[PDB]
Amino acid sequence: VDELFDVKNAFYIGSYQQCINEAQRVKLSSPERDVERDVFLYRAYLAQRKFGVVLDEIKPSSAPELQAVRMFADYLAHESRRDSIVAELDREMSRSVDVTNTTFLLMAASIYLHDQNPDAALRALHQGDSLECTAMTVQILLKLDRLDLARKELKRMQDLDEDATLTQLATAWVSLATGGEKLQDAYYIFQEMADKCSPTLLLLNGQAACHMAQGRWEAAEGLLQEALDKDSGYPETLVNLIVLSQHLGKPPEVTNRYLSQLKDAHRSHPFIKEYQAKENDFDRLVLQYAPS
Amino acid sequence: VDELFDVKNAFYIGSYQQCINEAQRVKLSSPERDVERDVFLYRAYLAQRKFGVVLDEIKPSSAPELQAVRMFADYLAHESRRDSIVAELDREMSRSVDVTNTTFLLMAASIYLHDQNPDAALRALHQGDSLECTAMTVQILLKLDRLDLARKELKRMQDLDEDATLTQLATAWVSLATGGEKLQDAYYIFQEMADKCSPTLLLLNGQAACHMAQGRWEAAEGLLQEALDKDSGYPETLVNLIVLSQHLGKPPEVTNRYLSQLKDAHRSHPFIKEYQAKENDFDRLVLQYAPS
Amino acid sequence: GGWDVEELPPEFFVPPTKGTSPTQIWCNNSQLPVDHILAGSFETAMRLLHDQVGVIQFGPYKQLFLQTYARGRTTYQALPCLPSMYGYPNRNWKDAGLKNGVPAVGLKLNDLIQRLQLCYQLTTVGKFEEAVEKFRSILLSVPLLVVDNKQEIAEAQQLITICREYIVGLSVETERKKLPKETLEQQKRICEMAAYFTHSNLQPVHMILVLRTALNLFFKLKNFKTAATFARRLLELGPKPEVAQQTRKILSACEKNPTDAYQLNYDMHNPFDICAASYRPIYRGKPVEKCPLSGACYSPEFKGQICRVTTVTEIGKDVIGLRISPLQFR
Amino acid sequence: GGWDVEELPPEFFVPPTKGTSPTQIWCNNSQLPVDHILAGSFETAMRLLHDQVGVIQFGPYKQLFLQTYARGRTTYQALPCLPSMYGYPNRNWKDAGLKNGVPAVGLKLNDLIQRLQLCYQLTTVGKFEEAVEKFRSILLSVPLLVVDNKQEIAEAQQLITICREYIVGLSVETERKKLPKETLEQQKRICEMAAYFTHSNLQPVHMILVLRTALNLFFKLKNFKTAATFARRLLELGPKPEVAQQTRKILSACEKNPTDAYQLNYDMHNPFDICAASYRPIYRGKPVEKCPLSGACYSPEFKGQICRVTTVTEIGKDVIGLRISPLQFR
Numbered sequence A, B: 001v002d003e004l005f006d007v008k009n010a011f012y013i014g015s016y017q018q019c020i021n022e023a024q025r026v027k028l029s030s031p032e033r034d035v036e037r038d039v040f041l042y043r044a045y046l047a048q049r050k051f052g053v054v055l056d057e058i059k060p061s062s063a064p065e066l067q068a069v070r071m072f073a074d075y076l077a078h079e080s081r082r083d084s085i086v087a088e089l090d091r092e093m094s095r096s097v098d099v100t101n102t103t104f105l106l107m108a109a110s111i112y113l114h115d116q117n118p119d120a121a122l123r124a125l126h127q128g129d130s131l132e133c134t135a136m137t138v139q140i141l142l143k144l145d146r147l148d149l150a151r152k153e154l155k156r157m158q159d160l161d162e163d164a165t166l167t168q169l170a171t172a173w174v175s176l177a178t179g180g181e182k183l184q185d186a187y188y189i190f191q192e193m194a195d196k197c198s199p200t201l202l203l204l205n206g207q208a209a210c211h212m213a214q215g216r217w218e219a220a221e222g223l224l225q226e227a228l229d230k231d232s233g234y235p236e237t238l239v240n241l242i243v244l245s246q247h248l249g250k251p252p253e254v255t256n257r258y259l260s261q262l263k264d265a266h267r268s269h270p271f272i273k274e275y276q277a278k279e280n281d282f283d284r285l286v287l288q289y290a291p292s
Numbered sequence C, D: 001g002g003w004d005v006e007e008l009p010p011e012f013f014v015p016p017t018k019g020t021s022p023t024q025i026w027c028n029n030s031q032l033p034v035d036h037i038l039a040g041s042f043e044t045a046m047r048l049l050h051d052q053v054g055v056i057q058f059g060p061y062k063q064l065f066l067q068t069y070a071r072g073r074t075t076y077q078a079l080p081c082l083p084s085m086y087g088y089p090n091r092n093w094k095d096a097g098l099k100n101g102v103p104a105v106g107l108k109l110n111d112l113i114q115r116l117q118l119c120y121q122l123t124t125v126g127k128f129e130e131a132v133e134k135f136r137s138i139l140l141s142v143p144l145l146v147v148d149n150k151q152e153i154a155e156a157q158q159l160i161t162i163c164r165e166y167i168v169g170l171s172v173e174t175e176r177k178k179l180p181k182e183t184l185e186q187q188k189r190i191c192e193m194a195a196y197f198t199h200s201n202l203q204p205v206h207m208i209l210v211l212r213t214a215l216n217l218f219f220k221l222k223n224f225k226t227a228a229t230f231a232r233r234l235l236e237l238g239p240k241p242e243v244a245q246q247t248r249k250i251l252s253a254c255e256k257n258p259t260d261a262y263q264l265n266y267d268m269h270n271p272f273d274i275c276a277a278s279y280r281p282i283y284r285g286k287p288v289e290k291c292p293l294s295g296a297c298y299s300p301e302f303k304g305q306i307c308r309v310t311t312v313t314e315i316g317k318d319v320i321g322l323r324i325s326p327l328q329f330r
Helices: A005-012 A015-022 A030-049 A051-057 A064-076 A081-093 A102-114 A118-126 A131-143 A147-160 A165-178 A182-194 A199-213 A217-230 A235-247 A254-260 A271-289 B005-012 B016-023 B032-048 B051-057 B066-079 B080-093 B102-114 B118-126 B133-145 B147-160 B165-180 B182-193 B201-213 B215-228 B234-249 B252-262 B271-289 C022-029 C033-039 C042-053 C059-070 C107-127 C129-145 C148-178 C184-198 C205-222 C224-237 C239-254 D021-028 D033-037 D040-054 D059-070 D108-125 D129-143 D150-177 D184-198 D204-220 D224-237 D241-255
Strands: C074-075 C085-087 C270-272 C281-283 D074-076 D085-087 D270-272 D281-283
Touching: A005 A015, A005 A030, A005 A165, A005 C033, A015 A030, A030 A064, A030 A147, A030 A165, A051 C129, A064 A081, A064 A102, A081 A102, A081 B066, A102 A118, A102 A131, A118 D040, A118 D204, A131 A147, A131 A165, A147 A165, A147 D021, A147 D033, A165 A199, A165 C085, A182 A199, A199 A217, A199 A235, A199 C074, A199 C085, A217 A235, A217 C281, A235 A254, A235 C059, A235 C074, A254 A271, A254 D129, A271 C042, A271 C059, B005 B016, B005 B032, B016 B032, B032 B066, B051 B066, B066 B080, B066 B102, B080 B102, B080 B118, B080 C033, B080 D241, B102 B118, B118 B133, B118 D033, B133 D085, B147 B165, B165 B182, B165 B201, B165 D085, B182 B215, B201 B215, B201 D074, B201 D085, B234 B252, B234 D074, B252 B271, B252 D059, B271 D040, B271 D059, C022 C033, C022 C205, C033 C042, C033 C059, C033 C129, C042 C059, C042 C129, C042 C239, C042 D129, C059 C129, C107 C129, C107 C148, C107 C205, C129 D224, C148 C184, C184 C224, C184 D270, C205 C224, C205 C239, C205 D204, C224 C239, C281 D033, D021 D033, D033 D040, D033 D059, D033 D129, D040 D059, D108 D150, D108 D204, D129 D204, D150 D184, D150 D204, D184 D204, D184 D224, D204 D224, D204 D241, D224 D241
Parallel strands: none
Antiparallel strands: C074 C085, C270 C281, D074 D085, D270 D281
16 A cells, blocks of 8 residues: 555645645655655645745756756746757657656646647657556547547556556546546546545536536536635636526626636636737728728 | 690690690590680780780680680780770679689689689689699699698599699699708799790799709709790899809999899799889888988 | 558757737637637637628727637646746637647527517617617627527527617617607607508517507608508417507597598508618618618618618628628638 | 607687798798898888997998899799789798798809909009999998808908998099198108008009009109108019109119208107098097998098998997807807
């Protein structure tokens, strides 16, 4: 049994502060486990957008896995530096990488996904053998609308460890993309993790998306209101509330309030940029049917 | 269909000689129509100021309708007799009148209008039921600056016979007094009667007055010159030419020639008397601001 | 014969290539404009609106398009610190599969029929500009419906007709109120417009107010013969008692002098349509060009122009017809 | 709020009574004298002329009044053998109605400006009596204008000023020609008048002739210092070559002896106005009574008398001012 079970569990379901709290309490029964714990601790500070902690505390003498976390933190914190970091990453990968260092591969692939380079991220993940590497592949494959490939990678996680948190979570993502009967499946996975641990923003919206996919808008309203009460700035709640509002017949002034609230979500969800893009697409197509 | 259509038509548009000519040609298909024809024949001789024909040929044995025409002729021919004729007319009316004899009512009302008694003339016309009685009421009402009452009487003629010559003519007189868009209406009525029949002095000046009311003085010049060529003595042409001259910037010597020509118009148009009256009014008001 | 068996068995690291997005699947499976707007395919949606219902000026659609776009997809986080996922909720979700999905229905016909009531109230209290805005929103919203059966397609068409009647009527009245009342001729024109408004097909409560207005105006004009018939029709709708009494009083005053003073351009016994741009009558046989979506009638000078009612269509364009149901694609 | 409805319905053979005549409608709607003269209301027209522009002696207006009266109404026959009808043409005929009409414009400002040219020619050929008559007709005609905008009111006022300048100038010259030239003192008076005529504001062609006259007279007097300045001003207007040469000759003869022999009553460097009745200068500060219409200046002995220029006004009467446009009644 894994001494870091609760720590990784808290991190993957989005319960970052519980992860940080539980990492600072566990006893150093190795130096392998010691570094693994510190990796999740700083990844949790990353998830809270507290990049300063990561950047200040991981020094050039710190372990290679921590250097990978700090690489990612440097990227997230410094927009001006992103293109150069990506460039250096490209060279590292072309040169030689410790393939057993899955923490490094996951950080590299994270950076690539944010730099909108799923090919590079998948190429990096392919080199690793770990459960989170497969899970991140499942996710990226789903984003590429390759439900078939995602199903194969998920089957790998299912054969290796059926009861693992990452395996349940990947099962839910695959189910949410499959639709049909499988949607109810996803819901209970999300529910079962909420009622073992704690209902996080991530799990609240997972459950919400399952309900909304079945057309059960009133059932989703409670979940979204609870998520809105926990954190007024989590964007996925705001987007889902727009969808839900319109399916409950509420006035356009509500959709407008959520759209204005989303410009201050201070978390980088693409929805507003896509929205403004479709605003520009529309203006241009107006001038195509009537060249004023 | 009325055998006397052309005869009455010619008379009402002022084409007196054509009326006389066409009356002497029609075939005696009744004794009712016979007397009606003779009435218009002698009214046409009246219109040509040939009172001698009327006075000599209508004898005391002639029909009552002809006696009414000859009454009017006696009045027009004999200034010294006018006040006595009017007196006798007053008594006849107070005593008993055949109300179906519209020819008599029209002759009585003619005499009253010339004796400057519109009340008596309207009172006589009220007793009759015929299209010319209504038309003569429309005319007298317009002279009394009661466009409202004239509109009601005109509406009566319009409901009874829209296409009748008297109804068109009354429509034009009402339009000429209404002004505005309706002026163009009057013009075409006058024009349409000229281009079905013949352009008479009466129709030429009707059209002229429509143009002048719209301010279209140059458009009126042609009509008035044509009327002047047909009859150098018709007064309405002379008066209209005075107005037109001044609106075309011509010298006061032209207005003076028309004013001198009007003293020999040998038709009794009131304009010269009103003019000399305003001459006297002016002389007197001069002596009011400076009692020499 | 035989059974169910008596095909062809076939013959580094490469990053995979993308599959079709679920929004593209939407566009493939649907010919209804709202589904394309939910998919984010604005251009194919505009093509569908132009060919089916005649939209050419799409400016006044911006709100409807963007807001519809915003309800199309849900979003949820997968792994921490990575870009979130999108969900694409289908209306046929029980059996959509990978290839057959078609998006959830976000605007239902009865939402619109409910907005009708706020339009009606606005009209009753006299806020004509705001009632016209709300009415036009319902009108432009109707082509974004998704609708099951033939009776709902009927109801939607009736709804469009209602919004049109009210828009052209209130437009007539708003223009009559902007006109001068000095000349007799100017007053004749005002009465004409009030009489046209009488021939709009509104709800009895509103037709009572338009007949009250017309009755007053034709009474001041002294057109007592036509005013009398306005009074009789108003009395037949069954107004509230105080109005019925004032109306009966005006009616017996009209009948104690049943004469019209002026010929106006208004035929009582002759059906016409109101030119929605010049506010003159187009009598039933004469040439007319129409709005392909609303049914607004226009005098032919205006063919090819932007309909004053809908504000987005081409007068007189030939079109497929409104499409708002799977039924219409057998 | 509400609508547009939320009045009072009321309670033998008799000959009807007359309505208002269209000429009375004219008088009601207009404060311009010409409109009242067209209406046949001479007394109210005279009141307007007296209060606005100061006419008290109306005799010399008889022609203008009567002729204006004669253009006011048209006439046409209705039924045969009955008294003819009158028509009352309105300038606002498109929208006059029953109550608002106001008569057609029969004298336009440019007709008068055109008559100016015949006045000028008459002056040039030397027919002073006939030029004064034509000038006075233009002057008295100006208050019978009807005029649209403020610039035309300006032009009309300038026109009045022009007619005045020419009338008083030619009056001065006509009186100088009637005076004896025997005494030295009589000759001094003649020169004085010629020098005053120099200060009239005429057209350059005419100011050249008045300077030529003055130059000759002041040269015979041996007032070579003032004669020299008349010569220099004449040369500066640019006369025809033969006159320029004769003038340059007289100028160098004046400068070869630049002495004035006599003190005359004529101040070269001092602006004055010419008393239009006694033909003496009234120097710019001193007391003066004026014509309220033309601007003729008079020495104060003459206040209350009949202006020699216009021949119809009261010198020095206070008046509203010329009215010849609807503009002036806001």
